[PDB]
C-alpha cells in the first residue's frame, strides 16, 4: 500500500519533469548573443567602514538608500550613513552570536536574529532617544537563517527548524507556518510586489510560497549542494540562487523551470551572498575565495571581478535606488563600490 | 567644508567609536570556551562546577579572566553550518563519559565527533580540552566487563590505570596535526575546582603559546 504511494509520487514527479522538458524549447545563451554584452565593468571603492572588531555575518540596506545596518559577531550591530561614514547607532545584543539583520522599509524598526532561535526587533524612532529592544520572536526551535520585514507589523523569518514563519509584531506569535522542506533553510527573499516569497535549504532545492494563503505553490530542484543565498529578480518573475557548488542557477516563475547555470572552472568555493541590479542585466555574487564577482544576468559570462577584500565576503547588498553596492566580509570590513 | 550639525555628528561618531573600542578592550581580556559533547556526557555536572535555547552561555570567573562557555550540543540541530561561527574561540572543552564505552558503539560515535571537531578546517590552531567523567564507575564496569569489546584490535591487562592511559592515548592519536594543535587531557578529578584550576592553567599555557606565536618566538 505504501509502495503504491511511493510509486504514485515518483510517477507524478516524472510527469512534472517531462512537462517541464516539453515546455523547454530554447536557451537564453543562444539568444543573448544577439544583444551586445556590456563588456568590462570597474567598481572603484568609494567608502570603507572601519568600525567592527569581529567578523560580520549579515548586512542590509535601507529603503532610503543611504542608511545600512551591519551585524557582526562582536555582539553589537551598527547603523551606518553611506555618504558621511557616521556611526548613527551601535545597539548591543543580548547574545553575540548573530546570523541576520533586517531593516524595515519605513526605517523605524530593525530586525536582527542569531543562534538563540530568536529574532529581536529594535525600535529606532523613540521618545526616549535610546535604542531599546521592542520585541523578541522566540519559539522557532532551530538557529535563525534570516528575517525579512514585510510591514511594520509583519515579518517572515527562516529557521533551522527547516521552516519559515510569518509572525505578528504586535502580538508575538506566528500567524502562518511554512514547512515541507527536508533540510534546514539558509536564506530567504521577498518579491518586489511582496505577494510571494522563496526559500532555499540544504535540500539543494528552492521552493516558493503563497503569502496570502500560506502554502507553497511549487518547488525547483537541480542544485548539487546546500543553498546559502537567494536573490529575486527585480521584475519579480525570476531569480538566481547560490550554493557551495559555485553554481548560480537561474529559475523563472512563470516558466517554472531553470534557464541557465552560472558555473566557471576558475572558482570552486561556495557562494555566500547573491544580489541583482536595478535593471537586472547583471548580478553580483560573493564567494568564499575573498573576491566578489559580477556576472551578466543574461549572457551567463564573467564580466569582471571585485577583489577588494582579503577574506571571505559574508554578505553584500545593492541599493534599491541602484547607486552603490556594499560588501561586508569577515575581516570586520564594509566596503562601498560605485 | 562641514556644517555645525555635521561636526556634531562627527563628534558623536567618534564618541561611539571610543565606546566600541573600550567594549572591545573589555571583551578582549576575556577567554572564550566552546563546551560541547554527546548526550548526558557530564556537561550538566561541568556547568554545575563552573558557575559558583540553543546557546547556553555559562558565565563565571576565576582569580581573573572572567571565563565564558557556550554549550551548543544540548540543542538538536544541524552539524556543520553554524560551527564556523565559533572561529577564534580560545579553547574547546570536550566532555566524554567513560561509562558509555559499553552502551550502544557510543564510544565510536564520540570518537567520530572528536575527529570531526579536531581536524575541522576552522579549528586548525585552537587546542582541545578533554574530560573523562564517571572514571570510578568506569573502573567498576571494566571490572565487571572485558576490554576487547570496545576495540576488537586492542587487548591488554584489564587494569584501570593501563586502560585509562590507553584510551587517553587513543583519543590523542586521532589528530592529524600536532605542531599547532595540542590536546590537554584530564580525568574529572572529584567534584572540586581542581578541574577549574586545570582548565585555567591550560588556558594560561595556550595563551602564552599563541602570544609567542604572534611575537614570532614560538
Amino acid at each position: 500500500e505504501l509502495d503504491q504511494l511511493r510509486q504514485e509520487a515518483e510517477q507524478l514527479k516524472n510527469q512534472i519533469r517531462d512537462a517541464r522538458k516539453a515546455c523547454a524549447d530554447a536557451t537564453l545563451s543562444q539568444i543573448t548573443n544577439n544583444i551586445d554584452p556590456v563588456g568590462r565593468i570597474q567598481m572603484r571603492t568609494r567608502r570603507t567602514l572601519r568600525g567592527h572588531l569581529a567578523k560580520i555575518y549579515a548586512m542590509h540596506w535601507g529603503t532610503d538608500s543611504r542608511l545600512l545596518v551591519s551585524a557582526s559577531q562582536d555582539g553589537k550591530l551598527i547603523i551606518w550613513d553611506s555618504y558621511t561614514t557616521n556611526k548613527v547607532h551601535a545597539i548591543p545584543l543580548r547574545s553575540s552570536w548573530v546570523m541576520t539583520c533586517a531593516y524595515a522599509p519605513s526605517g523605524n524598526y530593525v530586525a536582527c536574529g542569531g543562534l538563540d532561535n530568536i529574532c529581536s526587533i529594535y525600535n529606532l524612532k523613540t521618545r526616549e532617544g535610546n535604542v531599546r529592544v521592542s520585541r523578541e520572536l522566540a519559539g522557532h526551535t532551530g538557529y535563525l537563517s534570516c528575517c525579512r520585514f514585510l510591514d511594520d507589523n509583519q515579518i517572515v523569518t527562516s529557521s533551522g527548524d527547516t521552516t519559515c514563519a510569518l509572525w505578528d509584531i504586535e502580538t508575538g506569535q506566528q500567524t502562518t507556518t511554512f514547512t515541507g522542506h527536508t533540510g534546514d533553510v539558509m536564506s530567504l527573499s521577498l518579491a518586489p510586489d511582496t505577494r510571494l516569497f522563496v526559500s532555499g535549504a540544504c535540500d539543494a532545492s528552492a521552493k516558493l510560497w503563497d503569502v496570502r494563503e500560506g502554502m507553497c505553490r511549487q518547488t525547483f530542484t537541480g542544485h548539487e549542494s546546500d543553498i546559502n543565498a537567494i536573490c529575486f529578480f527585480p521584475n519579480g518573475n525570476a531569480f538566481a540562487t547560490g550554493s557551495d557548488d559555485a553554481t548560480c542557477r537561474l529559475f523563472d516563475l512563470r516558466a517554472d523551470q531553470e534557464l541557465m547555470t552560472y558555473s566557471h572552472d576558475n572558482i570552486i568555493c561556495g557562494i555566500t551572498s547573491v544580489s541583482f541590479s536595478k535593471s537586472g542585466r547583471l548580478l553580483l555574487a560573493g564567494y568564499d575565495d575573498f573576491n566578489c564577482n559580477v556576472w551578466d544576468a543574461l549572457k551567463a559570462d564573467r564580466a569582471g571581478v571585485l577583489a577588494g577584500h582579503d577574506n571571505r565576503v559574508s554578505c553584500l547588498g545593492v541599493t534599491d535606488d541602484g547607486m552603490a553596492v556594499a560588501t561586508g566580509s569577515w575581516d570586520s570590513f564594509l566596503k562601498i563600490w560605485n | 567644508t562641514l556644517s555645525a550639525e555635521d561636526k556634531a555628528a562627527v563628534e558623536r561618531s567618534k564618541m561611539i567609536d571610543r565606546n566600541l573600542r573600550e567594549d572591545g578592550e573589555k571583551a578582549a581580556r576575556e577567554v572564550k570556551l566552546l563546551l560541547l559533547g554527546a548526550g548526558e556526557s557530564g556537561k550538566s555536572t561541568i556547568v554545575k562546577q563552573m558557575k559558583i535555547t540553543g546557546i547556553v552561555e555559562t558565565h563565571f570567573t576565576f582569580k581573573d579572566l572572567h571565563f565564558k562557555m557556550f554549550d551548543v550540543g544540548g540543542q538538536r540541530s544541524e552539524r556543520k553550518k553554524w560551527i564556523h561561527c565559533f572561529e577564534g574561540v580560545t579553547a574547546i572543552i570536550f566532555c566524554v563519559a567513560l561509562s558509555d564505552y559499553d552502551l550502544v558503539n557510543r564510544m565510536h560515535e564520540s570518537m567520530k565527533l572528536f575527529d570531526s571537531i579536531c581536524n575541522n578546517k576552522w579549528f586548525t590552531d585552537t587546542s582541545i580540552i578533554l574530560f573523562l567523567n564517571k572514571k570510578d564507575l568506569f573502573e567498576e564496569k571494566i571490572k565487571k566487563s572485558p576490554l576487547t569489546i570496545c576495540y576488537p584490535e586492542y587487548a591488554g591487562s584489564n587494569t584501570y590505570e593501563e586502560a585509562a592511559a590507553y584510551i587517553q592515548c587513543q583519543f590523542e592519536d586521532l589528530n592529524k596535526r600536532k605542531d599547532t594543535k595540542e590536546i590537554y587531557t584530564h580525568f574529572t578529578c572529584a567534584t572540586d575546582t581542581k578541574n577549574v584550576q586545570f582548565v585555567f592553567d591550560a588556558v594560561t599555557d595556550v595563551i602564552i603559546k599563541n602570544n609567542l606565536k604572534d611575537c614570532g618566538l614560538f
Partner: single-chain antibody, 231 residues
C-alpha cells in the same frame, strides 16, 4: 520624559548665580544641551551649548567668559553658573535637548523655563508680528534671512517653533520640510535660501501663539522676530 529647572531668583547687579536642571525619562548622556533666553517681552535668544560628554562648548558673544556651564551625566544634571550679572540679564531661561544624527530632530523637547530678575550672526527676519485669524482659515507665515540657509549637502537647516501663551515653545518643522513627531499634519513649510514660509491649513483652536524661525547653519543660533496669532 521631563526637564525641571531650578536655582533662579532675584539678585543684585554684578552678583552671581548658578542654576541647575534635572532631566528624566531619557538617556541624559546621549543628548547635547542648549540654554536659551526669552526676554520679558521680546523673543528667544540662544545662550550656550554643551556637546555630548562635554566635548565641545559654545558661548554667545554677549555672555562669553562671564557665563559658564557644565553637565554631570551620572545624575542627569546641568549647571549654568554666571557672575557679575548685569541688569539686562533679567529674563526667562530654558534648557533644551538636541541630538544630531542623520534624520534626527534636535530641539525635540523644551524645559519648563525659569524666570530671572535683576534690578557675524545670521539674522532671521519676520516681516509682520501680529495677524488676526479665525478658525478654519489657512494662513501662511513668511520669514526671511540675511543669508541662504541651504547648505551644499542639500539640507536647509531651518526650524519653526510655536509658543502658546504661558508655556514653553515646541518644534513645529525641522529642516523646513519634515514634520516632527506628535505634531498635526495640517502644518507644512516651504521656501528657499533666505526666504521661507510655513502654511497652516484648516486652522483650529489651541493653534494660537508666537511663531519663530530659527537657523542652525552656524553658531550663534539666531531666532526670528516671532509672529503672534490673534483671534
Amino acid at each position: 520624559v521631563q526637564l525641571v529647572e531650578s536655582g533662579g531668583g532675584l539678585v543684585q547687579p554684578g552678583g552671581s548665580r548658578k542654576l541647575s536642571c534635572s532631566a528624566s525619562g531619557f538617556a541624559f548622556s546621549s543628548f547635547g544641551m542648549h540654554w536659551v533666553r526669552q526676554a520679558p517681552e521680546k523673543g528667544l535668544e540662544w545662550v550656550a551649548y554643551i556637546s555630548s560628554g562635554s566635548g565641545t562648548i559654545y558661548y554667545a558673544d554677549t555672555v562669553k567668559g562671564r557665563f559658564t556651564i557644565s553637565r554631570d551625566d551620572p545624575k542627569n544634571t546641568l549647571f549654568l553658573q554666571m557672575t557679575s550679572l548685569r541688569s539686562e540679564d533679567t529674563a526667562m531661561y530654558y534648557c533644551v535637548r538636541s541630538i544630531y544624527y542623520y534624520g534626527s530632530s534636535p530641539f525635540d523637547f523644551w524645559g519648563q523655563g525659569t524666570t530671572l530678575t535683576v534690578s557675524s550672526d545670521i539674522v532671521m527676519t519676520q516681516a509682520t508680528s501680529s495677524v488676526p485669524v479665525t478658525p478654519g482659515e489657512s494662513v501662511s507665515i513668511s520669514c526671511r534671512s540675511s543669508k541662504s540657509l541651504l547648505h551644499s549637502n542639500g539640507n536647509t537647516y531651518l526650524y519653526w517653533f510655536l509658543q502658546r501663551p504661558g508655556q514653553s515653545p515646541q518644534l513645529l518643522i525641522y529642516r523646513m520640510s519634515n514634520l516632527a513627531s506628535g505634531v498635526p499634519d495640517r502644518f507644512s513649510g516651504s521656501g528657499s535660501g533666505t526666504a521661507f514660509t510655513l502654511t497652516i491649513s484648516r486652522l483650529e483652536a489651541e493653534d494660537v501663539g508666537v511663531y519663530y524661525c530659527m537657523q542652525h547653519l552656524e553658531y550663534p543660533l539666531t531666532f526670528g522676530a516671532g509672529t503672534k496669532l490673534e483671534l
